[PDB]
Amino acid sequence: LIPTVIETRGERAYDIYSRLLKDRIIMLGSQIDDNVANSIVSQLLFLQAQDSEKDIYLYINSPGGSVTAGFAIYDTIQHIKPDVQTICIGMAASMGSFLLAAGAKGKRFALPNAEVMIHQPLGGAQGQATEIEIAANHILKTREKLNRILSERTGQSIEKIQKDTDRDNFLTAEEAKEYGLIDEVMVPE
Amino acid sequence: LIPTVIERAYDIYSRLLKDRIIMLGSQIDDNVANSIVSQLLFLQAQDSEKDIYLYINSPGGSVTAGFAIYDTIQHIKPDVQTICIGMAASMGSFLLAAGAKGKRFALPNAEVMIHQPLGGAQGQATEIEIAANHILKTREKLNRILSERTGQSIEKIQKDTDRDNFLTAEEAKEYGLIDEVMVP
Amino acid sequence: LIPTVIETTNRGERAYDIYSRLLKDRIIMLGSQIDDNVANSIVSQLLFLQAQDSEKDIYLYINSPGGSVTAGFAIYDTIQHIKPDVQTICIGMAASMGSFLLAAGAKGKRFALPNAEVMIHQPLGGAQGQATEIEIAANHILKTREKLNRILSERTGQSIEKIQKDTDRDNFLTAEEAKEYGLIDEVMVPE
Amino acid sequence: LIPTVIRAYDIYSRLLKDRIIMLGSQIDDNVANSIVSQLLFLQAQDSEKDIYLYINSPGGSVTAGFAIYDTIQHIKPDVQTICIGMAASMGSFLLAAGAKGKRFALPNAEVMIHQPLGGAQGQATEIEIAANHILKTREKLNRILSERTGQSIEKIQKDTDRDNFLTAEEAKEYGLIDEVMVPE
Amino acid sequence: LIPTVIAYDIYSRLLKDRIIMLGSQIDDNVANSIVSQLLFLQAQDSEKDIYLYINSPGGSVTAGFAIYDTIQHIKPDVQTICIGMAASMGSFLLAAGAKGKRFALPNAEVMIHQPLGGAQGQATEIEIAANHILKTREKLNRILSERTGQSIEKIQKDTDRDNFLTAEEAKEYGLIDEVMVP
Amino acid sequence: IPTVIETERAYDIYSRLLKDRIIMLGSQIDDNVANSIVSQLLFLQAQDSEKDIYLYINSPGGSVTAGFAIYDTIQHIKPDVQTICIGMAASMGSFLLAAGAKGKRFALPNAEVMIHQPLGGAQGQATEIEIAANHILKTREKLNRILSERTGQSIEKIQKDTDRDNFLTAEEAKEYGLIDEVMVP
Amino acid sequence: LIPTVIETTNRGERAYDIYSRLLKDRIIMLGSQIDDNVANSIVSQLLFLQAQDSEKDIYLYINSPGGSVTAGFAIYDTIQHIKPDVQTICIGMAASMGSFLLAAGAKGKRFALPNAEVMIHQPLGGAQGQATEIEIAANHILKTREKLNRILSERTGQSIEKIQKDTDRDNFLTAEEAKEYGLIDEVMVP
Amino acid sequence: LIPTVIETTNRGERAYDIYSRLLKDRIIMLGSQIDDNVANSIVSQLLFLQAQDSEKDIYLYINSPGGSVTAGFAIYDTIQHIKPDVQTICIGMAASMGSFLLAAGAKGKRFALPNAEVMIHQPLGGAQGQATEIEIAANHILKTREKLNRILSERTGQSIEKIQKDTDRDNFLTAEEAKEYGLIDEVMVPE
Amino acid sequence: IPTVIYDIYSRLLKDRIIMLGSQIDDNVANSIVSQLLFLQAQDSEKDIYLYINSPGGSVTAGFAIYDTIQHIKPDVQTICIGMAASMGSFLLAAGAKGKRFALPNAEVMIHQPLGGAQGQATEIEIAANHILKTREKLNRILSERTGQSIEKIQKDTDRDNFLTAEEAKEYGLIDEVMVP
Ligand SMILES: CC[C@H](C)CNC(=O)N1CCC(=O)N2[C@@H]([C@@H](C)CC)C(=O)N(Cc3cccc4ccccc34)C[C@H]12
Ligand SMILES: CC[C@H](C)CNC(=O)N1CCC(=O)N2[C@@H]([C@@H](C)CC)C(=O)N(Cc3cccc4ccccc34)C[C@H]12
Ligand SMILES: CC[C@H](C)CNC(=O)N1CCC(=O)N2[C@@H]([C@@H](C)CC)C(=O)N(Cc3cccc4ccccc34)C[C@H]12
Ligand SMILES: CC[C@H](C)CNC(=O)N1CCC(=O)N2[C@@H]([C@@H](C)CC)C(=O)N(Cc3cccc4ccccc34)C[C@H]12
Ligand SMILES: CC[C@H](C)CNC(=O)N1CCC(=O)N2[C@@H]([C@@H](C)CC)C(=O)N(Cc3cccc4ccccc34)C[C@H]12
Ligand SMILES: CC[C@H](C)CNC(=O)N1CCC(=O)N2[C@@H]([C@@H](C)CC)C(=O)N(Cc3cccc4ccccc34)C[C@H]12
Ligand SMILES: CC[C@H](C)CNC(=O)N1CCC(=O)N2[C@@H]([C@@H](C)CC)C(=O)N(Cc3cccc4ccccc34)C[C@H]12
Ligand SMILES: CC[C@H](C)CNC(=O)N1CCC(=O)N2[C@@H]([C@@H](C)CC)C(=O)N(Cc3cccc4ccccc34)C[C@H]12
Ligand SMILES: CC[C@H](C)CNC(=O)N1CCC(=O)N2[C@@H]([C@@H](C)CC)C(=O)N(Cc3cccc4ccccc34)C[C@H]12
Ligand SMILES: [Mg+2]
Ligand SMILES: [Mg+2]
Ligand SMILES: [Mg+2]
Ligand SMILES: [Mg+2]
Ligand SMILES: [Mg+2]
Ligand SMILES: [Mg+2]
Ligand SMILES: [Mg+2]
Ligand SMILES: [Mg+2]
Ligand SMILES: [Mg+2]
Numbered sequence A: 001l002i003p004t005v006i007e008t009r010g011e012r013a014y015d016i017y018s019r020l021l022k023d024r025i026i027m028l029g030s031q032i033d034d035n036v037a038n039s040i041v042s043q044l045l046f047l048q049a050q051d052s053e054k055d056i057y058l059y060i061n062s063p064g065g066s067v068t069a070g071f072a073i074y075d076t077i078q079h080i081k082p083d084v085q086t087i088c089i090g091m092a093a094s095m096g097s098f099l100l101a102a103g104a105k106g107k108r109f110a111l112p113n114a115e116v117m118i119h120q121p122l123g124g125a126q127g128q129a130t131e132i133e134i135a136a137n138h139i140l141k142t143r144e145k146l147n148r149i150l151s152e153r154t155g156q157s158i159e160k161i162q163k164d165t166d167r168d169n170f171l172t173a174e175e176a177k178e179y180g181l182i183d184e185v186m187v188p189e
Numbered sequence B: 001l002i003p004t005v006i007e008r009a010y011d012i013y014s015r016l017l018k019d020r021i022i023m024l025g026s027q028i029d030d031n032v033a034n035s036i037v038s039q040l041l042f043l044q045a046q047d048s049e050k051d052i053y054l055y056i057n058s059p060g061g062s063v064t065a066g067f068a069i070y071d072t073i074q075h076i077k078p079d080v081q082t083i084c085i086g087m088a089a090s091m092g093s094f095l096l097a098a099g100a101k102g103k104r105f106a107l108p109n110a111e112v113m114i115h116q117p118l119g120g121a122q123g124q125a126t127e128i129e130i131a132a133n134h135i136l137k138t139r140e141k142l143n144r145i146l147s148e149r150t151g152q153s154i155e156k157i158q159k160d161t162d163r164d165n166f167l168t169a170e171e172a173k174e175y176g177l178i179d180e181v182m183v184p
Numbered sequence C, H: 001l002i003p004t005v006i007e008t009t010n011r012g013e014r015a016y017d018i019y020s021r022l023l024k025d026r027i028i029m030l031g032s033q034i035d036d037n038v039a040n041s042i043v044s045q046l047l048f049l050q051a052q053d054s055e056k057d058i059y060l061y062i063n064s065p066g067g068s069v070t071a072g073f074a075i076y077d078t079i080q081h082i083k084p085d086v087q088t089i090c091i092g093m094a095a096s097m098g099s100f101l102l103a104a105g106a107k108g109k110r111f112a113l114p115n116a117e118v119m120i121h122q123p124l125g126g127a128q129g130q131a132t133e134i135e136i137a138a139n140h141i142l143k144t145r146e147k148l149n150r151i152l153s154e155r156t157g158q159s160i161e162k163i164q165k166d167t168d169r170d171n172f173l174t175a176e177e178a179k180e181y182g183l184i185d186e187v188m189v190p191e
Numbered sequence D: 001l002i003p004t005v006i007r008a009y010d011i012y013s014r015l016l017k018d019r020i021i022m023l024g025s026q027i028d029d030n031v032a033n034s035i036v037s038q039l040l041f042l043q044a045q046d047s048e049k050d051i052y053l054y055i056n057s058p059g060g061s062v063t064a065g066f067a068i069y070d071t072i073q074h075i076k077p078d079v080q081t082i083c084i085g086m087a088a089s090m091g092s093f094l095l096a097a098g099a100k101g102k103r104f105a106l107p108n109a110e111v112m113i114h115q116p117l118g119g120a121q122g123q124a125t126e127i128e129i130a131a132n133h134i135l136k137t138r139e140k141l142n143r144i145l146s147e148r149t150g151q152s153i154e155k156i157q158k159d160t161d162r163d164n165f166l167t168a169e170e171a172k173e174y175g176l177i178d179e180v181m182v183p184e
Numbered sequence E: 001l002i003p004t005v006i007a008y009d010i011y012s013r014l015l016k017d018r019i020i021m022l023g024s025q026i027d028d029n030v031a032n033s034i035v036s037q038l039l040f041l042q043a044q045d046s047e048k049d050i051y052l053y054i055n056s057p058g059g060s061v062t063a064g065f066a067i068y069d070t071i072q073h074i075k076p077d078v079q080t081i082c083i084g085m086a087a088s089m090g091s092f093l094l095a096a097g098a099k100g101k102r103f104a105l106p107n108a109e110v111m112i113h114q115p116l117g118g119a120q121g122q123a124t125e126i127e128i129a130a131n132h133i134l135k136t137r138e139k140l141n142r143i144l145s146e147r148t149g150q151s152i153e154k155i156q157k158d159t160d161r162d163n164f165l166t167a168e169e170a171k172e173y174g175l176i177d178e179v180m181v182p
Numbered sequence F: 001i002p003t004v005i006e007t008e009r010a011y012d013i014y015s016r017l018l019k020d021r022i023i024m025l026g027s028q029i030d031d032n033v034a035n036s037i038v039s040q041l042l043f044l045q046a047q048d049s050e051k052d053i054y055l056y057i058n059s060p061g062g063s064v065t066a067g068f069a070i071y072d073t074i075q076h077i078k079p080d081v082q083t084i085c086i087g088m089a090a091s092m093g094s095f096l097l098a099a100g101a102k103g104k105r106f107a108l109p110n111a112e113v114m115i116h117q118p119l120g121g122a123q124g125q126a127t128e129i130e131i132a133a134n135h136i137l138k139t140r141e142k143l144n145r146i147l148s149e150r151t152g153q154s155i156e157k158i159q160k161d162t163d164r165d166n167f168l169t170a171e172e173a174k175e176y177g178l179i180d181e182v183m184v185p
Numbered sequence G: 001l002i003p004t005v006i007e008t009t010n011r012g013e014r015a016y017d018i019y020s021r022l023l024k025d026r027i028i029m030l031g032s033q034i035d036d037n038v039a040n041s042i043v044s045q046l047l048f049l050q051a052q053d054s055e056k057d058i059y060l061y062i063n064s065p066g067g068s069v070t071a072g073f074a075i076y077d078t079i080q081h082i083k084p085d086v087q088t089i090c091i092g093m094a095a096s097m098g099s100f101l102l103a104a105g106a107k108g109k110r111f112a113l114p115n116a117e118v119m120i121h122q123p124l125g126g127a128q129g130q131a132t133e134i135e136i137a138a139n140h141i142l143k144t145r146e147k148l149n150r151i152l153s154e155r156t157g158q159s160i161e162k163i164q165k166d167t168d169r170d171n172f173l174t175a176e177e178a179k180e181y182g183l184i185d186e187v188m189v190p
Numbered sequence I: 001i002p003t004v005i006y007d008i009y010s011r012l013l014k015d016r017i018i019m020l021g022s023q024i025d026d027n028v029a030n031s032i033v034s035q036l037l038f039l040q041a042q043d044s045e046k047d048i049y050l051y052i053n054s055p056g057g058s059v060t061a062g063f064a065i066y067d068t069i070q071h072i073k074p075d076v077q078t079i080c081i082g083m084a085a086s087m088g089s090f091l092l093a094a095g096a097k098g099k100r101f102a103l104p105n106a107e108v109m110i111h112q113p114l115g116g117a118q119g120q121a122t123e124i125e126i127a128a129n130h131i132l133k134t135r136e137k138l139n140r141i142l143s144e145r146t147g148q149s150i151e152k153i154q155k156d157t158d159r160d161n162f163l164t165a166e167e168a169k170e171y172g173l174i175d176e177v178m179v180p
Helices: A016-022 A034-050 A067-079 A095-100 A129-154 A158-164 A173-179 B012-017 B030-046 B063-075 B091-097 B125-150 B154-160 B169-175 C018-024 C036-052 C069-081 C097-103 C131-156 C160-167 C175-181 D011-017 D029-045 D062-074 D090-095 D124-149 D153-160 D168-174 E010-016 E028-044 E061-073 E089-095 E123-148 E152-159 E167-173 F013-019 F031-047 F064-076 F092-098 F126-151 F155-162 F170-176 G018-024 G036-052 G069-081 G097-103 G131-156 G160-166 G175-181 H018-024 H036-052 H069-081 H097-103 H131-156 H160-166 H175-181 I008-014 I026-042 I059-071 I087-093 I121-146 I150-156 I165-171
Strands: A004-007 A012-015 A025-028 A056-062 A084-093 A108-110 A115-118 A122-128 A169-172 B004-006 B009-011 B021-024 B052-058 B080-089 B104-106 B111-114 B165-168 C004-009 C012-017 C027-030 C058-064 C086-094 C110-112 C117-120 C124-130 C171-174 D020-023 D051-057 D079-087 D103-105 D110-113 D117-123 D164-166 E019-022 E050-056 E078-086 E102-104 E109-112 E116-122 E163-165 F003-006 F009-012 F022-025 F053-059 F081-090 F105-107 F112-115 F119-125 F166-169 G004-008 G013-017 G027-030 G058-064 G086-095 G110-112 G117-120 G124-130 G171-174 H004-009 H012-017 H027-030 H058-064 H086-095 H110-112 H117-120 H124-130 H171-174 I017-020 I048-054 I076-084 I100-102 I107-110 I114-120 I161-164
Touching (some): A004 C012, A012 A016, A016 C036, A025 A034, A034 A056, A034 B052, A056 A095, A056 C036, A095 A129, B012 B021, B030 B052, C004 C018, C012 C018, C027 C036, C069 C131, C097 C131, C110 C175, C124 C131, C131 H124, C131 H131, C171 C175, C171 D124, D020 D029, D020 E028, D051 E061, D079 E028, D090 D110, D103 D168, D110 D168, D117 D124, D117 G131, D124 D153, D164 E123, E010 E019, E028 E061, E089 E102, E089 E109, E102 E167, E123 F126, F003 F013, F003 G013, F003 G018, F009 F013, F031 F053, F053 G036, F064 F092, F064 F126, F081 F092, F081 G069, F105 F170, F126 F155, F166 F170, G004 G018, G004 H018, G013 G018, G013 H012, G018 H036, G058 H069, G069 G131, G086 H036, H004 H018, H086 H097, H086 I059, H097 H110, H097 H131, H117 H175, I087 I100, I087 I107, I087 I121, I107 I165, I114 I121, I161 I165
Parallel strands (some): A025 A056, A084 A108, B052 B080, B080 B104, C058 C086, C086 C117, E050 E078, F053 F081, G086 G110, H027 H058, H086 H117, I076 I100
Antiparallel strands (some): A004 A012, A122 I114, B004 B009, C124 H124, D117 G124, E109 E163, F003 F009, G004 G013, H117 H171, I107 I161
């Protein structure tokens, strides 16, 4: 079940996630596919139309998923006028950590015991040599694209990103900070 | 869960629809086509002058379902803008190029893919032949419209669609599949 | 079918699902395996209750065999972050990250009912592929265990050495044993 | 379909309004959490008035059962227990857990007591740990059944070694219930 | 699936007029629902008759007994009307209706037979299960006897194997009082 | 299955052991295994009705009736049939171990012997459950009686001791009466 | 396909599958998981070889992940019972009952080749059903473990206390390490 | 169907399956995945051939994608143990322990035909369960790799540093490349 | 498989005829390599006949056969009956020069190597480079064997390409169509 919350100009009933969206909080708390991406793009656009000045809060607890779906979110984040803060809670892996890195400069956060993981894109291809070749070049170009943006966003060289993403690379919040994937570890109120 | 938004209480997609935004965010099958057709028809009825926005994040799908949307786009009075976000492949990229002239867009990192139609046939040689001609005709039809819509020659479309062909947003622009890359 | 509860408001009759009714009184139910979905729900509930009232206590009921470590830490960090004290009440059982969260309640406000069961053990996982890949997975789950153990030490007052011996294999505790161990503060006795 | 009654209530919610709780399935963590919540709510509404727990259950998880058990014993209100159809496993344990003098079964209700079930695979050391666990669990169950029924731990142990089917009248004689509810 | 009538679902609408529908296999869910319905109607009015529709192949013996005992316990007469079929615990409950108020419609089918079960494991466990089902059968057979007027000996002969009855046959047997006529 | 050559007739290892009056019961006991062993016994008798036969037993048991096929044949033939438990003998496995010729029933030191009650199943009508229950109960009395006769233990004790799985060392099996002797190096 | 091998005897030609050929020279191949079938075959082979010649050594090759404990003891007991010395030679790996049988070879005639892998751990098993049945199974596998550990103590010279610590979890040993442990006497060199 | 071959001897006609016919001339075929059965078969052949003739060379044809490391080492250790030189000849491919065994042939007598393919990579494995179990599995496969790499170093003349870099991911070599790597001594050129 | 007073395939093998009449896997390669080596030892002068009715299969398996054909002294004639596809038609082309044949209605098919790769980008890359190198290798040899250019082979094998026996002759895959 998703719990319901009720506020008391009338009495309005909200599912907990909708209630958070009313305070400009978007939950990316699952594997990233086209459906999750559509929902989050819609939310971003709606929040912008309501107010193009106020910050947005993107909660990321996600193992990642589709690169293109992740980029649908990424590009929408960069297009809209409001700063989109990113907050890692639990883990951010794959495009999950890419999106965390994509938050507004100075406003990328993770809570202390959150886990950040970076690695190289995964894919698959079968058929003729020529089809294998196309699929190879495609995922290689996609990786260059990902790594270039990470370099811009973290301050690390493409050479270093390439090394450090060659195999699964698990980072503490703190380590994610010094790497430049986030700006700040959120310390207890 | 699809979030709710209270202004009247709307699911987020229906709230976008009230502002003439249609989301093509899935595989194109008959159901998606009937939904999108129904939304286009409805928005025209509400206002035949104002632009409509068709978001495209789709790996494509059924060609006939794609043409259901294409024909409905072209038939109605309003300009239907097309915005590629994430990717448009197969009939997805077809519908992207079918947007109103000067109002086809993609955000910078969106991916566009063009390739030939896919199908299958089993049974007697005569049935194979019928299915072969059918999908060969369908390709000519698709290529002909892409030619008209992109400004490229049928000759060039045939070569470039022979195998999977992945394009960047900027590349889709110089190809003629979109008009403009939407910048921040 | 989750039962419905209806109250009489002056602006009509408001109807709640039973869990939602409890959440109005600042009670959160962790009554399932901990996966990312359950974590997102509980994080959301915690953040909402803080917005409603930054000073009143929150009650987290725990009947959970545990689950994802990271999902658990989502909840853990949210608990530690917010202003309100979060009480923890173990009812039924609390194993794996369940017993971790139980121990993570506000100091002095971690409870178990007399017949509730607490279990502590080491984290479980897997790895396949090249030796280098196995090595990365091994280091990962070993670090995760160090992390868990270091916090349990701070939370229970037991040494890290002792936590590691005692979690090496499945370790079932009674409520009263959970108390002397330092995982909870008090065994709630009947009213 | 669960029927509705007209404040429009599903039947079980309607019964809940009169402090009646239905345990009418296998006991798992979900069923436990639902019943715990109902108990906590009814107490909040009125800490003085009796609650009625209807039991038609083959039983299930022991820990889940003890979630319910501890909650019944913690709250101020007397929880009556009423076995209708059957109580087995933790089902009949909870039947015995009702308020003294307010444990009932209808004339043809069946009550079954037996030892806990479980499993264990792996190293000998792990089997050992699992075996000590289910044995301690059994000790715990039998000690509380002894407190509740007036029978000895020794007798519970022997009488639960294998499946033990009881009539309502036998269950009364055993101390599992206080009374057989005769017709009005 | 379920039509609406004005608002009520069709089954809820019938429930307002003290009609309960047993139209499925009898399991613990169906029994809880029916028991809840019976309890609720009683509270609303302890005097007025209740109508229990039966179109069921039967199912769990214990679940059936949950319904049966609830029927006998409440103040109101519970009428039973067999429509379509009543088998196993289905036909048992038909017979458990208020005396003089047990009905079937002319083409309704009633079937009686001995309870079904299973057992595997040690000989000792097969023995426990066998004694359990045999005792369950005597219980049912004893109650059918009381309800029909037939001797326990005859109930046991007639239930030894599947025994299908017409509504008119069900009447002379004692399972119902009356065939409802147009 | 290895082959051995004697000086030149070539045997599979098991057929060579059968030439020397050794029968191998080294699997679950089903009708096939019973018929094979019945046939090996009947033949070895015909060859020489005086000489001992050796029945190796490493078996978890299996079908009761199949087990009795072997038992009744062992008892029927003139020769003494020694039994040797190697590894384990459970269910009808240990029943056949006990059924060897008196004084000639053995287990090696680390062999394991398990006794327990028969297993079965029944579904359908009450009356059919009843028939299946009586059937397995009788089968158990019959087994127990014969164990009593062979072990020297009472039927009462056999029934208590077989009520659940009961694992015995070779030495325990000797003092139970299931075997006469533990074979030593 | 198992290769065939043909020799010229005095009394004609004799054709053997390779494993049967090796058996003629008193070599037994334990090269698989240990179940009842494998146990019955090896026991039969041991019995036959002793009947052929009670004095001459037998060679047991061990490349096995182990398997059934009882099937293992079938082999073990047969080895100890027959007059001839059974040499044990670990090639590839010996784990679980495999390494138990390796240690069970004739004293001073337990070998491994240099890159062979030996692994010792505790027995594995399973039980479901009533508390009472879980108890029985538990006792059964704990007794089995004592049994195995006691014999390993005798065979290696290590204390029972040490055997139990060192078998608590999977414990991989090099051939050289198996020698210092006392599971083998010698590492066979080229 | 494996074909049969029949020769004329002085004790009548002897009939061989083709593989057995090759074994008579001291040719062993490793032409499948390496599992325990294959290793036992090949070990037995090696031992048999040594007994027949402790002096004459043996020929080990290798067309194998590899397989079990321990199975591979059974063969490897048997090769080094017996008196006779074992020549290795790669035909088709050698990958994994297949290429390890290729390298393991007698010095100066390791060969591949011109279009044969040699692949080297790191060992593959799996682990599940408690952190402590994963760690044991990790150390095991890491040690296994060190063992493989150290022997390859001896056998090829390359350093351990290089063997590790070059085996990090799948590394396909031509016959000629295999020769300059030191995995083989010679490419067999047509007669 | 019928017997002859030898099984039929073994009977043919006595007369130096090898049958490649199935998919090519490592087993089939090992068998055919063994038969070739045997036949050479019996007589290093006399021709061998390789019957090909195969849809092909593993490339490395096929190269096992290919290399063994080229290594031994005897001319290996190739005779395509039924069909030859993938490495089937590669081996047909690998026969001794002047002694590669097909019966009139036999079918010959040439196409590019098939394969697969999943995992990290870097792994897809290695697999891609591998199958691409493998295709370069096949094409270079086909070129040497047919007289056709590498560039022509490349385009001609881009998709499935069916040839008649006659077309296979003028392509250079065989030397002659065997007539009644
Ligand atoms: C709840 C009210 C509603 C969201 C406000 N309306 C609105 O945002 N609109 C309509 C009017 C309009 O001119 N625009 C424009 C711009 C104002 C977008 C900021 C537009 O291009 N789109 C296309 C579009 C479509 C879909 C996704 C998208 C993502 C990212 C860039 C565009 C996208 C929709 C946009
Ligand atoms: C919410 C109000 C409503 C949408 C306004 N009504 C309307 O647009 N109508 C009814 C009256 C009418 O005359 N027409 C006509 C035209 C006005 C179409 C714009 C019509 O052909 N159709 C058929 C139709 C059917 C289905 C899909 C379609 C797609 C594309 C062309 C037609 C299509 C429906 C159309
Ligand atoms: C019912 C209304 C609403 C819940 C009150 N508003 C609110 O809690 N907000 C918005 C305004 C705001 O400034 N913040 C801030 C702080 C006030 C967090 C307490 C913020 O960082 N987040 C990010 C976030 C996002 C998601 C989960 C989270 C968990 C734990 C720390 C943060 C988290 C959201 C936070
Ligand atoms: C419909 C209104 C609402 C239910 C009344 N409020 C209430 O019951 N509350 C909040 C305020 C409060 O002080 N308490 C306290 C006590 C009053 C519990 C009766 C509390 O410990 N809990 C924790 C809890 C949590 C979960 C399960 C439970 C089971 C059994 C003992 C406790 C449990 C929640 C409790
Ligand atoms: C819609 C209002 C509500 C139904 C009226 N209240 C009511 O029936 N109640 C509460 C108060 C009360 O004293 N009783 C009593 C009696 C009045 C039962 C008629 C009671 O025993 N139960 C237990 C019960 C519990 C569950 C199933 C049941 C079956 C069959 C006999 C009992 C059963 C519940 C009963
Ligand atoms: C190697 C030669 C051959 C086995 C010797 N012949 C022989 O034993 N025969 C035939 C002639 C004969 O008179 N008999 C007789 C008796 C001599 C049995 C000892 C016989 O009853 N049977 C039936 C039989 C049939 C099957 C199984 C059996 C088990 C156990 C008792 C009998 C059984 C077969 C028996
Ligand atoms: C190739 C011919 C043949 C093997 C030589 N004969 C022979 O070994 N025999 C028969 C005669 C005999 O007196 N014995 C005796 C002893 C000589 C056993 C060494 C015996 O007890 N058995 C039983 C037996 C049965 C099965 C397995 C066994 C394992 C281990 C101890 C015994 C075992 C068989 C033994
Ligand atoms: C066809 C005739 C027959 C093969 C010649 N006999 C023979 O090779 N024998 C027996 C006599 C003997 O003393 N030895 C010795 C040596 C002569 C081994 C070369 C021995 O240790 N083994 C053990 C063994 C067992 C299994 C595999 C093996 C691998 C590799 C090293 C040993 C191995 C067997 C060896
Ligand atoms: C039944 C009679 C037997 C076939 C004649 N003996 C023979 O051909 N031998 C042994 C003696 C010998 O010097 N050689 C040599 C050459 C004579 C191979 C022609 C050799 O390299 N091999 C390795 C080998 C192994 C496997 C496949 C192969 C393919 C193709 C090149 C080699 C290959 C085996 C070869
Ligand atoms: Mg922005
Ligand atoms: Mg238009
Ligand atoms: Mg706090
Ligand atoms: Mg109470
Ligand atoms: Mg009544
Ligand atoms: Mg006899
Ligand atoms: Mg000995
Ligand atoms: Mg050597
Ligand atoms: Mg040649």
